[PDB]
Amino acid sequence: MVEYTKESVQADPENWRSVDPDNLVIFETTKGVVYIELAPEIAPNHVAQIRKVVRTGLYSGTKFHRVISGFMAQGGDIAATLGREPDLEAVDGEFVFRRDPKSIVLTVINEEDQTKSQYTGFYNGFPIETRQDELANYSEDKRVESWMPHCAGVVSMARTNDPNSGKDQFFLMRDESRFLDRKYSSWGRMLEGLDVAKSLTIGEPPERPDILVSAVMVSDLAPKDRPEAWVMRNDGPMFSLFLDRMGRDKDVCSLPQTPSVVFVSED
Ligand SMILES: [Mg+2]
Ligand SMILES: [Mg+2]
């Protein structure tokens, strides 16, 4: 809706947060590129797992083997294309995190007095849903339960009925899917490439699935080769204007994603 230049973003740290290259993953697919920001504060062990799997090279060539319109695109089944079970352990479910409301502060969408058991907002460009902050007054850890809801753009971990079976398979959220919330380990967000995810070939499985051609951690690239990503600061005034413009009656998943931009290197 609004295009932001690299110059305008770099000059304005009040409104733009630079993404850590070790939190930035490039998924090159047969429908285009997806840039994912990892969310270590939301799912620390899953974020470590994704870095680990990416760095094995084993995601390369994995299919998007389960793609459901209006839901998600699932990929990352290494065994299916490697031809053998990979040397890879499962990761325990991380469906919620314990948030300190004095430390990790959500930007609310509506400033009106809250009256529900839960609310949503943004932190570092990630959508967040939470139990009420007032519970932290008396909880044993002075924290409250929060999670990253499965809005379009979120990236999460596939699993079986076993909550600890997440390992390699992931899904790219194509549409708001709140029935997944608190049941699947969301761990990242597509800064760019939601449209790419929404274009992956549908099927269970597709006859001829799209492919995750390569995955790269940006921190593993030489400095001059690194794309540079920025995410609008939810607590800054440009985001206030964005909410004004888009509608503050909307829940976090009915808004667009937090404005984000990825700039690739010159030749
Ligand atoms: Mg769709
Ligand atoms: Mg409250």
Numbering used by the authors: 0 to 266
Share the article's original sentences.
Hirschia baltica contains two cytosolic and five periplasmic canonical single-domain PPIases, but also two large, homologous cyclophilins with 293 and 300 residues, which we term AquaCyp293 and AquaCyp300, respectively. Our data reveal a unique two-domain architecture of AquaCyp proteins, in which the catalytically active cyclophilin domain maintains extensive contacts with a composite domain formed by terminal extensions and internal insertion elements. The crystal structures of AquaCyp293 and AquaCyp300 demonstrate that AquaCyps fold into two domains, a classical cyclophilin-type PPIase domain and the NIC domain with a novel mixed alpha-helical/beta-strand structure.
Similar to the highly active human Cyp18, AquaCyp293 shows very high kcat/KM values, which range between 106 and 107 M-1s-1, and the maximal differences between peptides are only 6-fold (between Leu-Pro and Glu-Pro). Most of the residues known to be important for activity in hCyp18 and EcCypB are also conserved in AquaCyp293, in agreement with their catalytic competence. The residues Arg65 and Gln73 of AquaCyp293 correspond to Arg55 and Gln63 in hCyp18 and are essential for catalysis. The C-terminal extension forms an elongated structure that contacts the N-terminal extension, the inserted domain, and the cyclophilin (PPIase) domain.
